[PDB]
Write a protein that binds this ligand. Structure first.
Ligand SMILES: Nc1ncnc2c1ncn2[C@@H]1O[C@H](COP(=O)(O)OP(=O)(O)O)[C@@H](O)[C@H]1O
Ligand SMILES: [Mg+2]
Length: 240
C-alpha cells in the first residue's frame, strides 16, 4: 500500500474526499514532508486515537502527525506517532477539518528510503495524482505546493471548465449513450485519460484505441457493474 510518497498522498486525499471536503490542500517537500489539509467534517476527539488500515500503515513508516477538529467541536486534537509508536496527543486550535503531516517517510527503513526515486520524479507522480483527483472532483478545490511554490491551483467549476483548467486547452465535449460516454477532446497539442465509473483506468488496450480513433482525450465512462461506442463517439466532433 505504501511504497512512495505518491501512495501516501493518495490515501490522504482519498480520506479527505471521503470526509466530503470541498477544499483539499497538498504540500510536499523534497520524502521529507507530505501534508494534506482539508475542510471536511473532521474526526471526533474520542476517535482521533483510534485511527492510527491506511493511516496505520502510513504512521508506522513515518514521523506522523494528524490533527482534526470535528464539525461539532470548538477545538481540535492532534496525535503524534513515530513508526507506529504513539508519542502523545494534544489539544490544538484549528479550523474545522483535518490536517495530516507525514515526515521522513521510511526513515526506519533506510534501504527502502535510499531506493526512492529522485525528488523530481516523485514530484511529477504527485502532480499527476492530484490532476487525476481533480478531474473527477470538479466541485472540489485542489491546491498543491511543492518545494514551497504553488504548483497547482484548481477552483470549483463545471466538469468541462475543470478539464480545461487542468490541461490548459480548449476542448470539445462529445457524448454517446445502459452505457454512457462523455469525452473532452483537443486536437492539436498526445494524452489519453480514462475514468470508468469515476475511477482512473490505466488500461493499455483502451489508450491505444483512443490513440487510434483520435490529441488530448479525456473519457468519462459510466458502466453497470464498449469500444464500438467509443469509435462511434469519435465521429461526433462538430464540422467547423
Ligand atoms: N481527512 C479525514 N477526515 C475525516 N475522517 C478521516 C480523515 N482521514 C481519516 N479519517 C477517519 O479515519 C478512518 C481511517 O482512515 P483510513 O486508515 O484511511 O481507513 P479507511 O479510510 O479505509 O476507513 C476513516 O474511516 C475516517 O473515519
Ligand atoms: Mg482511507
Amino acid at each position: 500500500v505504501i511504497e512512495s510518497p505518491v501512495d501516501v498522498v493518495k490515501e490522504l486525499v482519498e480520506n479527505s474526499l471521503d470526509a466530503k471536503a470541498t477544499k483539499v490542500e497538498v504540500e510536499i517537500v523534497k520524502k521529507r514532508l507530505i501534508r494534506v489539509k482539508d475542510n471536511g467534517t473532521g474526526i471526533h476527539p474520542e476517535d482521533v486515537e483510534k485511527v492510527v488500515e491506511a493511516l496505520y500503515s502510513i504512521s508506522s513508516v513515518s514521523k506522523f502527525k494528524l490533527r482534526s477538529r470535528f464539525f461539532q467541536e470548538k477545538e481540535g486534537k492532534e496525535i503524534e506517532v513515530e513508526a507506529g509508536n504513539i508519542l502523545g496527543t494534544r489539544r490544538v486550535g484549528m479550523p474545522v477539518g483535518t490536517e495530516v503531516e507525514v515526515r521522513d517517510l521510511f526513515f526506519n527503513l533506510p534501504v527502502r528510503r535510499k531506493f526512492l526515486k529522485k525528488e523530481d520524479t516523485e514530484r511529477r507522480k504527485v502532480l499527476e495524482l492530484i490532476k487525476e483527483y481533480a478531474l473527477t472532483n470538479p466541485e472540489v478545490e485542489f491546491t498543491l505546493f511543492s518545494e514551497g511554490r504553488e504548483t497547482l491551483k484548481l477552483k470549483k467549476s463545471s466538469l468541462k471548465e475543470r478539464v480545461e483548467e487542468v490541461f490548459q486547452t480548449k476542448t470539445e465535449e462529445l457524448y454517446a449513450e445502459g452505457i454512457t460516454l462523455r469525452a473532452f477532446v483537443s486536437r492539436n497539442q498526445g494524452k489519453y485519460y480514462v475514468f470508468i465509473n469515476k475511477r482512473p483506468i490505466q488500461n493499455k488496450n483502451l489508450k491505444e484505441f483512443l490513440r487510434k480513433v483520435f490529441t488530448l482525450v479525456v473519457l468519462y465512462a459510466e458502466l453497470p457493474p464498449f469500444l464500438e461506442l467509443v469509435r462511434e463517439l469519435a465521429g461526433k466532433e462538430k464540422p467547423i
